[PDB]
């Protein structure tokens, strides 16, 4: 009778905390036509050289 569907994505339930998070850096990437973009990477993480903007 009834037909059910499911997108392939897990749904959690937690509290959106704003105070205590894992800290993180910011790096600037530069494209060919003078565009700049800032990507927040994690702290304990390697900073890759090139990055698709």
């Amino acid at each position: 009778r009834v037909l059910r569907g499911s997108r392939l994505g897990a749904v959690s339930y937690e509290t959106d905390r704003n105070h205590d998070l894992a800290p993180r850096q910011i790096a600037r990437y530069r494209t060919d036509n003078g565009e700049e973009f800032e990507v927040p990477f994690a702290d304990d993480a390697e900073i890759p050289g090139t990055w698709l903007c």
Binding site: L3, R4, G5, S6, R7, L8
Partner: protein
């Protein structure tokens, strides 16, 4: 009748450059979901075919331009690209609509608004509500008027 649209473009802070188009946006995938049912019978959302046709013809045109071809092939490919974007924005406007399996026309991006099945006509038709119920009715000849 021409000064109408000429003063319309002059009076506002618009520009006539945006009637030709150079980048096409993509609606988010939760509004066009590919959900599976019970048993793996997948259910797409009928805009992904239009987006796939636009992506395919654009990639083929890029390959043809990088390759270098005579003018007939490039003009045919650009005409097909233009008709793909036209079918994406409004199917069935220019000539025969792009159809799917069983001669059924695909619900394009503008068909979510107009018609009896659009967003506007539904949103004026009303939603369905929680905390409701129905049943058959019978006469209540002992109740008071506010009961």
């Amino acid at each position: 009748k021409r000064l109408k649209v000429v003063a319309a473009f002059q009076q506002s802070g618009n520009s006539p450059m945006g009637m030709v188009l150079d980048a096409v946006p993509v609606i988010p995938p939760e509004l066009r979901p590919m959900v599976q049912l019970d048993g793996g019978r997948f259910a797409t959302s009928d805009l992904n075919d239009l987006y796939r046709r636009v992506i395919n013809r654009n990639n083929r045109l890029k390959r043809l331009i990088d390759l270098g071809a005579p003018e007939i092939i490039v003009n045919n490919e650009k005409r097909m690209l233009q008709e793909s974007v036209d079918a994406l924005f409004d199917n069935g406007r220019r000539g025969r609509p792009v159809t799917g399996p069983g001669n059924r026309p695909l619900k394009s991006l503008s068909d979510l608004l107009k018609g009896k099945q659009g967003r506007f006509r539904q949103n004026l038709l009303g939603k369905r509500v929680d905390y409701s119920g129905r049943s058959v009715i019978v006469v209540g000849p002992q109740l008071k008027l506010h009961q």
